[PDB]
Amino acid sequence: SSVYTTFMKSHRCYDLIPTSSKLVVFDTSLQVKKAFFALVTNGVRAAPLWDSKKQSFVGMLTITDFINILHRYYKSALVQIYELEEHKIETWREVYLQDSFKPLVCISPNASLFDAVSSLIRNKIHRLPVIDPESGNTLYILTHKRILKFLKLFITEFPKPEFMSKSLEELQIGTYANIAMVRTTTPVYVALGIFVQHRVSALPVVDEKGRVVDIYSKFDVINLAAEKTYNNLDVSVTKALQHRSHYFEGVLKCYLHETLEAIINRLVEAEVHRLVVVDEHDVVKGIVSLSDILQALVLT
């Protein structure tokens, strides 16, 4: 128990929703190719899935879905199987588990922010629909990014716990072993395979000396839905990153010996999902993600 735990347990999910927001919903009989293009066109990262037959929300369509489908699409094409691209949402969902069956994870606007964080961690998820039980409507999609920002802003800097002044290395927040990375020349299809195997939301791009020069993330993946690519998956990650060659400073990094406070501050101010942990010479040592931060704040 701390000033963070107290705050989270005494605030409702309702308090986090902006005055005005946009929500994209897909009927499950919609074509997959059309759904992912709708994500891009609407500037949105996820969409609740509506099953008309059941008159119910049954899941979410995210970039992780897109990664998995593209990976399967690429391998099937080399073996002359072409289905997915004319798959509807229900058929794609039927493919991947199907009893193995995963129900929709959601939360009430009146439930605590504590329960929201707990649900994200437990379910290994980044998108938590806030659903009003009276009307059944989805109001908002809650995220790590939004939650951390809220915490940073509405908690007074003081009554400050001792652990805020402690370094990442002291507190062991982040991942510092078996880091999923790609090289400058690594083809996109290989990168997708790495995404699927490690269930990770970003890949650092490194040179021959293991120094980070860029980052390949979920933002870069849905761009393949914008451009009518689907074909040129054999190109390098670098070529795929040309869509943002201009207007790009560099990768946001941190060091092992920075305080939790400084890193929370950097993550919030930058509006980014992770920092690449690096040494004196920009060699990748690990990743600290919003996932690690919120897991640390909820348990300590």
Added chain:
Amino acid sequence: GQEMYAFRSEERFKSPPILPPHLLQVILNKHVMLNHLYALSIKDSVMVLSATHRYKKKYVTTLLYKPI
């Protein structure tokens, strides 16, 4: 007694009411329009329906993508 007569206004509803200038036909994306249905032009057999609804103090604009 004498037969009685009927006076009917008739033309009060001969034409539908004109759209009041506060309700606008087109929104670019790119008040109280609350609860009103909006739509994109149908493209490639898909319809996009849209509306804005209030929950307490919050407004959400929902878009439904739905095949014909």
Added chain:
Amino acid sequence: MAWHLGIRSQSRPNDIMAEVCRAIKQLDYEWKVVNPYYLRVRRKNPVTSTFSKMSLQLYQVDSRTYLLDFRSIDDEVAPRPGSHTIEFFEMCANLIKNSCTV
């Protein structure tokens, strides 16, 4: 993105009304005629057993063109079936599909 309020038609106002009224009947919705261009519509959901309410209003936007407006009506962990907003969209869709053609 250009968003359009309801749907537009150049068909006769009385023919628009008669046709939405027939479509309502064919769909098993309840309705009330508030005035000749204003209808309240009520539906029992086949799956959920809950009720959905909306309004239909016809407007004239120019000398040959009319506008049909649809407005949802406000009443009074795994999710249960149902969503007022989505069901509103589905009512509208079903009504359009069964009353008119492009």
